Structure formats: C-alpha cells, structure tokens
Nucleic acid binder design. Structure first.
Ligand SMILES: Nc1nc2c(ncn2[C@H]2C[C@H](O)[C@@H](COP(=O)(O)NP(=O)(O)OP(=O)(O)O)O2)c(=O)[nH]1
Ligand SMILES: [Mn+2]
Ligand SMILES: [Mn+2]
Length: 430
DNA sequence: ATTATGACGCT
DNA sequence: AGCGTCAT
C-alpha cells in the first residue's frame, strides 16, 4: 500500500512533429499548404516511395511505404514533393537542418533527448517545480491549456470535437488539488502548461506544428502524443492507465510491435496490455527474460524508469543506399564508385558536424547486404576513422569488405551487392 | 523493388 | 566486435 511506489516521480513529455517532411516542404512551397500532399524518394520505380503524408492525404488512405503511383489511385489530386538527390542517392540534409531548428527551440525549456529526426523527450520535473513555486497555489485556468486533451475524460454525466475536449478539461481541472505542490496530477497539469508554451514557440519560430504527450515516463508520453494528432497535446495521468490499457493491443506499446510482442500474445494467450497485470513478475521473467519481464510487469501498471538522456545530437552519422533487383552492384568498379559516393556524402556531413558540435568520429562501420539474403545487413565490419577524407574512407571500406567477393574474376562482384552502408561512430570531443 | 536511417540489446 | 530487433 503506502510503500508501493507508483512511478509518478517525474513529468516527461514527448514532442513529435506532425507529418514532418511534408511540413518542411509546405513551408518552402506555399502551393502545397493545406493540400493532400506526400513526400517521396526517387521517381522512376512506381512513382517513388512515400515516406511522409499530410493529414488531408491520409483521409484518402495514403500511407507511408506506399508507391506514389498507387497513392495516386486513391487520391488523384495528391501533390508530391521529392527528396533531393545528390551523388546518385537520396539526401536528407534539408530535414536534418529543420530538425536542428526545432531541437534548439525545445532545448530552451529543458534538456532534451533527441529520439529521432522529428521528436524529442523532455524531463519537465524541475521546470514544473519552478512554475508551481511561481503559481503560489493559484489554480490553473483552462485558457492556459487551449490544445490539451485529458485522456479518459469526460466521463459519466457534447456533439462537437472541441466541445468534448473542453468538457474533459473542465472535469480534470475541477478535480485538481492545487494546494498540494507534490500532487502528481497537478504536476502533470503544469507540465502540460509548459508544453503548450513550447509548442507555441516551435510554431511561432519555425512555422511547424507538432503534437505532444505528457505523462510520468517516456512510454506513456509517446503513446499519449499519438492519441490526438495532429496539432494537439494529450495528458495521460497515472489514474487513466487501467482503462486505457484494458483495450490497448499489446503491439501499440513502443518495443512490443515485433517478435517479442507476438510472443507475449501467443505464450500468455492475451490480447491487451491490461491483461498483463494478472501475472507475477517472476512469471513474466520466466517467459521473456529478466529484463523484459521486469519491464513488462511495471509497464502494464503505467510504470517505467528509462531516463530522458541528455542528448540533443545523434550518436552516429550514416549514409546508406539499396540496390534492388537488377540494379545490384556486380562489378568492382561499381562497388568502388558507390562507396565513394556514400563516403563523399559522409565526409560532408562529418565535416559540418565537427564544425557545429566540437567532436570527431573515430570508427567507421561498413555494412553490406548480398543478393538472396533477406536480412537487413549481410555483414558488418569496423575500421579506424582517422581522417575526414572520402577517398580514404571509401578505400578503407573496400578493404574491409573485399573478402566478400566470391568471384574468382578480379573485375566481377559475386554475388551482387544490394546495399551499401557507411556509418561514423564513437565520437570524441575535439 | 520500400528506403534511409538511427537506437540499442545480446553474446 | 559482429549480429539481431525495433522502429519508421
Ligand atoms: N528516409 C526515411 N524517412 C522516413 C521513414 N519513415 C519516416 N521517415 C521520415 C519522414 C517523416 O516525416 C519523419 C518523422 O517520422 P514520423 O514521426 O514517424 N512521421 P510524421 O512526422 O511524417 O507524421 P506524424 O504526424 O504521424 O508523426 O521521418 C523512412 O522509412 N525512411
Ligand atoms: Mn512526426
Ligand atoms: Mn516521429
């Protein structure tokens, strides 16, 4: 009872940009704004592959991973923006630079954990304590939460979406105990006020809209963020978890959408996250390992301890290109030319990284996939990265992979290569 | 012939 | 170190 820690110590937010690459292109090209729009890479094969979709286009069924030609069958007026091509490959520099814009704004409010090109976690615990001090016990006005949903409300004792949002927010605020500076629900509410301010700053200073989740840990904050996109934020309280998880398919939790989540479902004969509560910690550890078992035992109760890491920058910088079907690399000249193309992009990104961030990569990882292998990587080899020079890096990558070529002929490459991947790792302060 | 990444756990 | 998983 009283000693049963409830994982309510922290206030954690997850901010995720809405249809991010689409918004970057819509900012640049006003003709694309407020339209069914998608971003594609390449064009020749089936119109290119869609990687981002505006909410207007999603209403027609357009999704990521869809070929543009098929998307056009669902949405004939779909507008398309193509990712830049440089050195024969997709070049995502524009979106990385836009990401840096957003991360630098978020960092004004708290130390952030960059989790992807378009999202970051925020530990707002200390900022919340400060704002609570400033409030001096003053209640929180609904006017300070103009885009916030409270998950699970309204309940009990109404036709429009905004009206439902305001009803739930009123029920939440009316039940708040604001004389207690240690009430977790109050702390979450102040966190949501701060996140409204952060999201307002992002939109004012970049033009980009985003959604967010506010809860007591990273997994619940990420889930919350998804609940009401686009352009809204959602508060998931500790008390909302039993109802939320009672119908939540296990795969919707981050980390359980693959083989492990399938094994939870099959071994235990359950469907929903809430059903996990009936098992002991030891039972879950016996099926899924000590670490996964403890994580599942806590997570189905709304509890997770993974910290928001103080990391605004990516840990690795990588360049990769697939060579599908008849485009697979089958000569030594081809392999060297594309290694050089990847290495040149890598050199340019690394040199800019060193200038901006006062650090140097020290290890080069070379990954390839060979024809007939379904795995992502057929082989990974590391070597030393001592100079930011594309010719040296491509020569070294060739040296570490060249023993892959089973062809006796010096010129041919067999079996052909369907992917090259260069990734710079192990950064040191320079 | 989804693609280009990036994080992280395991042994 | 190299591989596998999850993600998207
Ligand atoms: N190259 C590449 N980029 C991708 C891929 N998948 C996503 N991206 C890029 C394009 C995406 O814009 C961006 C962010 O990914 P999300 O947050 O998962 N999706 P979004 O922000 O579009 O919509 P929502 O409002 O639902 O969050 O990452 C991929 O497979 N390949
Ligand atoms: Mn997003
Ligand atoms: Mn995202």
């Amino acid at each position: 009872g009283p000693h049963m820690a409830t994982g309510q110590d922290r206030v954690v937010a997850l901010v995720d940009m809405d249809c991010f690459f689409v918004q970057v292109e819509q900012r640049q090209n006003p003709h694309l704004r407020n339209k069914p729009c998608a971003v594609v890479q390449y064009k020749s094969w089936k119109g290119g592959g869609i990687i981002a979709v505006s909410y207007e286009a999603r209403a027609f069924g357009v999704t990521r991973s869809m070929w543009a030609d098929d998307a056009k069958k669902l949405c004939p007026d779909l507008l398309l923006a193509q990712v830049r091509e440089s050195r024969g490959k997709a070049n995502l520099t524009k979106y990385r630079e836009a990401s840096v814009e957003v991360m630098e704004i978020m960092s004004r409010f708290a130390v952030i954990e960059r989790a992807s090109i378009d999202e970051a976690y925020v530990d707002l615990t200390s900022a919340v304590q400060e704002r609570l001090q400033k409030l001096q016990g003053q209640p929180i006005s609904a006017d300070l939460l103009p885009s916030t949903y409270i998950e699970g409300l309204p309940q009990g004792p109404t036709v429009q979406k905004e009206g439902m949002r305001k009803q739930g927010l009123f029920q939440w605020l009316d039940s708040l105990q604001i004389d207690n500076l240690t009430s977790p629900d109050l702390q979450l509410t102040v966190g949501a006020v701060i996140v409204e301010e952060m999201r307002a700053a992002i939109e004012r200073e970049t033009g980009f809209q985003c959604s967010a989740g506010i809860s007591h840990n990273k997994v619940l904050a990420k889930l919350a963020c998804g609940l009401n996109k686009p352009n809204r934020q959602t508060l998931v309280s500790h008390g909302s978890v039993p109802q939320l998880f009672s119908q939540m398919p296990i795969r919707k939790i981050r980390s359980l959408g693959g083989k492990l989540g399938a094994s939870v479902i099959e071994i235990l004969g359950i469907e929903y996250m809430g059903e996990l509560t009936q098992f002991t910690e030891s039972q879950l550890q016996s099926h899924f390992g000590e670490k996964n078992g403890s994580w599942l035992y806590a997570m189905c109760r709304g509890i997770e301890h993974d910290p928001v890491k103080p990391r605004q920058l990516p840990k690795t910088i990588g360049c990769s290109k697939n060579f599908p079907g008849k485009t697979a690399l089958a000569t030594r000249e081809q392999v060297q030319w594309w290694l050089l193309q990847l290495a040149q992009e890598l050199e340019e990104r690394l040199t800019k990284d060193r200038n901006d961030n006062d650090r140097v990569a020290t290890q080069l990882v070379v990954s390839i996939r060979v024809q007939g292998d379904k795995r992502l990587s057929s082989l990974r080899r590391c070597c030393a990265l001592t100079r930011y020079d594309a010719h040296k890096m491509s020569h070294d990558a060739f040296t570490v992979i060249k023993n892959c070529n089973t062809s006796g002929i010096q010129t041919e490459w067999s079996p052909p290569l369907t992917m090259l991947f260069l990734c710079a790792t192990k950064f040191s302060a320079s």
